[PDB]
Design a protein around this nucleic acid. Structure first.
Ligand SMILES: [Mg+2]
Ligand SMILES: [Zn+2]
Ligand SMILES: [Zn+2]
Lengths: 83, 103, 1335
DNA sequence: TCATATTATTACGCCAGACAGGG
DNA sequence: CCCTGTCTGGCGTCCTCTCACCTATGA
RNA sequence: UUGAUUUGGUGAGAGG
């Protein structure tokens, strides 16, 4: 559940970047393909995003690392499927 | 139950692309000037962007948004408000050459 | 997608390139059928087909050939919205000059062709002729010609001679006007003249002459040749309910211009005579000028009935144009509105929202959910399901609500706490249930209020509603540090009745093993809620580094304090509940909980406070009766003693012993004294009326009277209201402004009779009229403030400076009003504060001063802190993060991005409603004396008299801080001296303001220099005393033969030689001013401190006159340069004053209006920032004389005095940043090696980055001068014309921007609210960082 | 029905900004 | 020629709800 | 491809 986002503001200390990081993550869960890193208590993708932020496993650096890993996986998939 | 009113989507005016006003006309709430200043006072840049582009005026934005909501994709494709292009044609209909510059 | 918006003039080639066809015929439509007109205003070929992909007449009724245009239709083939973007053009037969460039004040064609507006209009309305390159005749180029002047010239210069009229002639003049040539001439003219007026008249003409050459704007583009017509879709022709078409006003305007243009083409075909085509072209000129901006010419045209019809400029300007009505504020889908109600079961992050509104606002989410499950197929099926409202869509609705916030909004939103985001809880009902604490943020009572709900659609908006705008996140008001979720009215009564005590109850003095059995003894019926009792409580004090240490003890407390201790979180000490808990105490309870335990315990503890307050206020049964308002038994004898006193005064009035004004003053004084005595009688009779015994004799206590707990708790009520319900209700005042001598001796529990209620209605009708007219000025003040701010975004982290204003505590002359901890709380210091002992680094030089630092400042008794202010910030285009300060609603520093101009403007203008609209020095405390700005001398008796007017008398305590301050005049009798210790209440100063002392420095004999009785001075021997005095005349009463004679007194020795000033070689002569009377006559030896002559003599519009920076009517005059001073010419309009500096150059002077009582003598040396007369002082003089920090201290003190007189807490950051936005423009003094001009006004960030990129080179920079513009002149003088056009007058700003060819690099908040994109402040600051990086 | 085209009331209160007048 | 009355323009609060009323002419 | 007119504008009154 969710009442305040205060710990998520503590771990991403800008309070304006929290919205952007959790929005990037909640778009990775909504359309999205991806599955959450945290157990869901029938919370929506907003609260699951912020709840991932509070326990310190999603920030901007982890999302860019995962997207570089997916870009390398697509690169290796294209190279190993064609050649 | 003469004051309770709500609007998701219905009819709008002619000149402008924004929703009509009132209850007898099935219309939405005027999100006035001081509410825009109150959203600027927070960091509500995306809430204000859908509050004046998708929810109100931009016709391509609101049809894409209705289809995006009912697909299950909360995402806005904003574009430019229609009443600002109405402003451009009313200013341009003077002897004034107002434009929109480089990419 | 696109950068800046460019505005320029419209060439006739550009207007033909916009166009799609010439609009000929004025015929609108057929009107008997449905078809339009071919080819009239609403054409087919010129614009497009009414129907989508259809020839209106007949061909193409499918989707194959989109474009073909047959001869039978003369129609394009595209979309229904294609006509909204397409515009037509009217080939104006006769040229017509634009009204926006002919009447803009100043006119664009008025200061360009060097011709007066009057003469320009004469020729323009076919009433005067104008010459154009005549030839070899005796006539100028600008000189005009009349009928008689032309007739004679016609017969004279019949050959080479040109003299046309109207726009045609004007056009030629502009067309044949070598811009470049004029530049040099004008520039050379400005450098070959000294005329002040001319200089300004030449610099304003050359500025608009070189600006036209810088852009691609031609001089012949001012006159309209190819008038453009607005798209039909934008001038819609819809019928109302009936059979007629309600036509717009622009169709009347365009149809008249086309009717007249067709008539003028036909008359130029037929070769009508001169006067016919002059009237025809003049009617076309007036028709075009009425179309563009109606009513700027003489009385505006009208269709139905006498009301004028609305033109294009009236579609732009005004409160109902496009900016203020459709681009800044829009009507909004997914929105709702209903009446609010309480619902106190809520947690403060959630609100109640009805099921009917919830099913209407969330129709697309329900459609998406229904389509996901598989219950239905097509969208229609889902719309039938929710139109029928079956049994399965309510589970769908509870599954779309759950974690989806909504924006509740009360309709007059003044500050940012009036839009807050909640989570819905569904309500059987039709009323929004709103959590009560949150009401004190919205200013929402429940007397019929309404609120709007808005739905954040996208995912970033749901996250902004949860992470920025959630109601748990707004628990501190952004104007200050005070909590805004303070418990308002019922809950403080429940607490004040709960945590209190009485001297005997059930369970007096029994001992309890915990708070749990305290509540168990209250519930079972064995003790009372207020019964004093030793309990054993375990308070957790967190004295280690983040570790909570338990200490358990026995507190002598009550039952209610233990029950309320069951709700307090762990870290707070027990002494927060040990007192009686009014409203100030519960506010600081929540404030100490927020400062210690953070946010989440403070949210859950605010809810538990509200729940236990409501529950024990329900258990209290705290009614109000008729017996609760206890009448004083002493009230009638007080009224009879006052009646005996007014009887004595009127018996003196019958015998004429006293005057009438002294009678009125004595009656108002005794009724004020009797009113205070009646209030003290009732206040004793209420505050300690209960007297109950305990085990023996009686003992008194504070009362449990109901109206007294409603007053003492601070729930609702004060001293004045409870005074008017029991004691007499004062002396009400008539609308003349003066008070009424017969008061209203009857309260409300006794009956008012008729006259007393009528006087009461005077006093209350004035208050209702004041609020209902005050609110307009309060709202317009908030508008001007958020449009001068509008741009200022926290955009750095350190500006890298060492300058900042000097925060001292403010002291008016009473006790120290606002302590230093209120002013330097959460503001980052400029240099490191020295500890008051000696040279210690107490705090470092860039530390935020939160509460722990401010307590270590209060322990050391720190004098004053040099702290960083927003007006000293060195950041170009924004404010750095340290020079702002603390976040104010967040504990930390301001984040990179958060818009501080808008929250500051709202925080100053939001208390605009609460504000109103319409001898010697006696010390109070006991301390040490200190003097500043002092040059003094010891008199003969010993009292240190002062030879300086501007001396500040401070009372410093034994610790080092400054506790008192006063202003002591020139020549006062100080009972004390420098550095001395006094007693509390001892008089330390004395003077006579009705007698300006002309006291000396040295001793000697007195001579009358230039003092001749008969012309200079006069003989007026005193009547009632006999001790005469030679009365000095002024320079106006004596005649012109002796007016040049200046009477004076110069002190000599026993021989006659001039005793010199100690330090110089100049004698001490004192020139006597006008209206003086000589006290000490000739031959009398003098000393210091003895006179040489007798010289006899605000609420809200104050806030407006400080921010708008008006001048007062009689300003205090100052000196622009230091040095010696003297007088001048005898009364030619004014009386001169010449200042010659000691080392600096002489030629500055000023002609003082001689109606002022001056301060300076002839032998006085002045300084910049030193006063010459007295009264109010304009801020421009502060800015150009003392400094920037002086004017920002002046505005923040002169407006915190209004906000403190009315009792509103606002931090000074907001006034410092609106002061920054006032003085943002500057003027050049020395142009230097840059590209500027001499007296050009340029904005400060521009000139600073210019000479900072030139000074980093070898070249030395440009030296500016700052100027203070008032807020509406400063927001209309911006480098962004949309920012200055969404605000006041759009005509002036759009013509200035058009003829300058101005460009709007958007870069602010309101340009991006207009153009429809992300704000460059909040969440969008990362987006604008990205876009500014990727260029 | 289908072109023809504009006249006999006053009663705000500052507050800047530009303009002819005169010592 | 620098003060100066005098005249002309340009402001004047947001949100909402109910009702009625809408150019004359004319061979 | 499955449907339609107030906003426009005035005046008066009301709510917070
Ligand atoms: Mg109310
Ligand atoms: Zn066709
Ligand atoms: Zn700074």
């Amino acid at each position: 559940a969710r009442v305040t986002v205060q710990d998520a503001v503590e771990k991403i200390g800008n309070r304006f970047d929290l919205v952007l990081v959790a929005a990037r993550r909640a778009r990775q869960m909504q359309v999205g393909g991806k599955d959450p890193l945290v157990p869901e208590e029938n919370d929506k993708t907003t609260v699951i995003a912020l709840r991932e932020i509070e326990e310190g496993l999603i920030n901007n650096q982890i999302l860019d690392v995962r997207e570089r890993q997916e870009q390398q996986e697509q690169e290796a998939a294209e190279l190993q499927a064609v050649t | 139950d003469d004051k309770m009113h709500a609007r998701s989507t219905g009819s709008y005016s002619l000149v402008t692309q924004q929703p009509l006003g009132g209850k007898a006309q099935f219309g939405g709430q005027r999100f006035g000037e001081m509410e825009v200043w109150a959203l600027e006072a927070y960091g509500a840049a995306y809430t204000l962007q859908e509050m004046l582009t998708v929810k109100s005026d931009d016709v391509n934005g609101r049809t894409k948004m209705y289809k995006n909501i009912v697909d299950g994709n909360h995402q806005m494709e904003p574009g430019m408000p229609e009443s600002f292009n109405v402003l451009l044609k009313e200013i341009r209909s003077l002897g004034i050459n107002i434009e929109l510059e480089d990419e | 997608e696109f950068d800046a918006i460019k505005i320029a003039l419209a060439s006739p080639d550009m207007i033909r390139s916009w166009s799609f066809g010439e609009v000929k015929k004025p015929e609108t439509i057929n009107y008997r059928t449905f078809k339009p007109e071919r080819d009239g205003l609403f054409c087919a070929r010129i614009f497009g087909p009414v129907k989508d992909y259809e020839c209106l007449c007949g061909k193409y009724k499918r989707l194959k050939h989109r474009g073909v245009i047959c001869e039978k239709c003369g129609v394009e083939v595209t979309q229904t919205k294609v006509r909204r973007e397409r515009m037509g053009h009217i080939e104006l037969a006769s040229p017509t000059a634009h009204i926006w460039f002919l009447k803009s004040l100043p006119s664009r064609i008025g200061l360009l062709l060097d011709m007066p507006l009057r003469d320009i209009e004469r020729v323009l309305y076919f009433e005067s002729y104008v010459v154009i390159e005549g030839g070899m005749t005796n006539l100028e180029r600008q000189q005009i010609l009349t009928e008689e002047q032309y007739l004679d010239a016609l017969e004279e210069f019949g050959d080479e001679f040109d003299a046309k009229m109207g726009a045609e002639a004007i056009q030629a003049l502009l067309k044949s006007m070598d811009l470049e040539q004029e530049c040099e001439q004008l520039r050379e003219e400005l450098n070959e003249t000294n005329s002040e007026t001319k200089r300004k008249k030449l610099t304003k003409r050359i500025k608009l002459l070189e600006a036209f050459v810088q852009s691609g704007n031609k001089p012949e583009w001012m006159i309209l040749t190819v008038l453009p017509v607005l798209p039909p879709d934008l001038r819609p022709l819809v019928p109302l309910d009936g059979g007629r078409f309600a036509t717009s006003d622009l169709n009347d305007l365009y149809r008249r211009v086309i009717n007249r243009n067709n008539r003028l083409k036909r008359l130029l075909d037929l070769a009508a005579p001169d006067i016919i085509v002059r009237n025809e072209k003049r009617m076309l000129q007036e028709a075009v000028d009425a179309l563009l901006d109606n009513g700027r010419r003489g009385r505006a045209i009208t269709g139905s009935n006498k009301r004028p019809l609305k033109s294009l400029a009236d579609m732009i300007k005004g409160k109902q144009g496009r900016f203020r009505q459709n681009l800044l504020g829009k009507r909004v889908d997914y929105s709702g509105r209903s009446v609010i109600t309480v619902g106190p079961y809520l947690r403060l992050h959630q609100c109640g929202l009805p099921k009917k509104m919830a099913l209407e606002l969330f129709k697309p989410f329900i459609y998406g959910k229904l389509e996901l499950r598989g219950l239905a197929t097509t969208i229609k099926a889902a719309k039938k399901m929710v139109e029928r409202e079956e049994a399965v869509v309510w589970d769908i609705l509870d599954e779309v609500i759950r974690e989806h916030p909504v924006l509740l909004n009360r309709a007059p939103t003044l500050h940012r706490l009036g839009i807050q985001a909640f989570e819905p809880v569904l309500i059987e009902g039709k009323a929004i249930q709103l959590h009560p604490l949150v009401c004190a943020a919205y200013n929402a009572d429940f007397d019929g209020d309404q609120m709007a709900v808005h739905v954040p659609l996208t995912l970033e908006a749901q996250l902004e509603a949860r992470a920025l705008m959630m109601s748990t996140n707004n628990i501190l008001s952004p104007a200050n540090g005070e909590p805004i979720i303070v418990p308002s009215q019922d809950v403080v009564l429940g607490l004040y009745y709960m945590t209190r005590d009485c001297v005997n109850a059930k369970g007096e003095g029994m001992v309890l093993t915990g708070p749990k059995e305290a509540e168990r003894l209250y519930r079972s019926g064995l003790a009372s809620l207020h019964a004093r009792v030793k309990v054993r409580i375990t308070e957790y004090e967190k004295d280690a580094n983040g570790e909570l240490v338990a200490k358990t003890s026995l507190k002598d407390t009550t039952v209610g304090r233990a029950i309320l201790w069951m709700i307090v979180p762990k870290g707070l000490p027990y002494s927060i509940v040990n007192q009686a808990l009014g409203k100030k105490a519960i506010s600081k309870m929540l404030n100490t909980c927020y400062r210690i335990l953070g946010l989440k315990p403070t949210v859950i503890f605010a809810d538990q406070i509200m729940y236990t307050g409501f529950a024990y206020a329900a258990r209290s049964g705290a009614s109000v009766g008729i017996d609760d308002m206890v009448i004083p038994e002493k009230k009638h004898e007080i009224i009879s003693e006052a009646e005996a006193e007014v009887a004595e005064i009127q018996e003196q009035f019958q015998s004429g012993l006293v005057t009438a004004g002294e009678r009125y003053n004595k009656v108002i004084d005794i009724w004020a004294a009797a009113n205070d005595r009646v209030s003290k009688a009732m206040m004793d009779n209420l505050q300690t009326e209960t007297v109950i015994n305990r085990d023996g004799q009686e003992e008194k206590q504070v009362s449990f009277n109901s109206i007294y707990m409603m007053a003492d708790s601070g729930a609702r009520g004060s001293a004045a209201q409870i005074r008017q319900l029991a004691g007499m209700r004062g002396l009400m005042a008539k609308p003349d402004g003066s008070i009424i001598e017969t008061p209203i001796t009857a309260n409300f529990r006794e009956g008012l009779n008729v006259l007393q209620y009528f006087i009461s209605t005077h006093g209350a009708r004035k208050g209702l009229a004041d609020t209902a007219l005050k609110t307009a000025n309060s709202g317009y003040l908030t508008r001007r403030l958020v449009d001068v701010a509008q741009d200022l975004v926290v955009t750095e982290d350190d500006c890298g400076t060492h300058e900042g204003i000097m925060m001292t505590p403010v002291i008016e002359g009473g006790d120290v009003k606002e302590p230093l901890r209120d002013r330097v709380l959460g503001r980052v210091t400029a240099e490191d504060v020295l500890k008051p002992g000696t040279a210690d680094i107490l705090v470092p030089r860039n530390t935020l001063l939160h509460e722990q630092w401010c307590d270590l400042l209060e322990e050391n008794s720190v004098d004053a802190v040099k702290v960083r202010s927003v007006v000293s910030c060195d950041t170009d285009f924004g404010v750095c993060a340290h020079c702002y300060g603390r976040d104010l609603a967040r504990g930390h520093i301001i984040n990179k991005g958060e818009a501080i101009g808008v929250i500051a403007a709202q925080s100053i203008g939001e208390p605009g409603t609460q504000l109103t609209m319409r001898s010697s020095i006696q010390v109070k405390n006991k301390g040490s004396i200190k003097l500043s700005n002092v040059k003094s001398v010891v008199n003969s008796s010993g009292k240190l008299v002062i030879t300086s007017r501007n001396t500040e008398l401070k009372l410093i305590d034994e610790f080092g801080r400054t506790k008192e301050s006063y202003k002591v005049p020139y020549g006062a009798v100080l009972a004390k001296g420098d550095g001395e210790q006094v007693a509390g209440g001892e008089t330390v100063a004395n003077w006579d303001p009705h007698t300006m002392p002309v006291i000396t420095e040295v001793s000697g004999f007195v001579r009358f220099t230039d003092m001749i009785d008969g012309q200079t001075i006069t003989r007026q021997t005193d009547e009632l005393t006999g001790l005469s005095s030679l009365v000095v005349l002024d320079s106006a009463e004596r005649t012109a033969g002796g007016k040049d004679l200046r009477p004076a007194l110069k002190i000599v020795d026993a021989q006659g030689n001039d005793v010199l000033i100690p330090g110089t070689d100049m004698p001490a002569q004192y020139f006597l001013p006008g209206k003086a009377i000589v006290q000490l006559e000739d031959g009398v030896q003098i000393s210091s401190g003895d006179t040489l002559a007798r010289i006899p003599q605000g609420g809200l519009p104050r806030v407006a006159d400080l921010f708008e920076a008006r001048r007062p009517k009689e300003p205090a005059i100052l000196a622009e340069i230091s040095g010696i001073v003297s007088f001048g010419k005898e009364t030619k309009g004014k009386r001169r004053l010449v200042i010659t500096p000691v080392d600096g150059s002489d030629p500055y002077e000023e002609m003082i209006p001689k109606w002022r009582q001056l301060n300076v003598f002839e032998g006085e040396r002045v300084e910049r920032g030193d006063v010459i007369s007295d009264g109010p002082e304009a801020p421009h003089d502060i800015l150009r004389l003392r400094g920037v920090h002086a004017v920002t201290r002046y505005i923040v003190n002169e407006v915190q005095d209004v906000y403190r007189l009315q009792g509103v807490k606002i931090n000074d950051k907001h006034i410092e940043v609106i002061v920054r936005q006032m003085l943002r423009k500057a003027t050049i003094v020395n142009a230097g090696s840059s590209d500027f001009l001499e007296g050009e006004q340029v904005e400060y960030s521009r000139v600073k980055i210019a000479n900072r990129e030139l000074e980093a080179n070898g070249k030395v920079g440009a030296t500016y001068s700052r100027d203070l513009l008032g807020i509406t002149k400063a927001s209309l003088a911006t480098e962004s014309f949309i920012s200055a056009a969404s605000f006041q007058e759009t005509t002036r700003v759009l013509t200035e921007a058009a003829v300058a060819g101005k460009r709007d690099e958007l870069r602010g908040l309101k340009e991006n609210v207009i153009v429809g994109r992300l704000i460059p402040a909040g969440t969008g600051y990362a987006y604008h960082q990205d876009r500014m990086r990727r260029r």
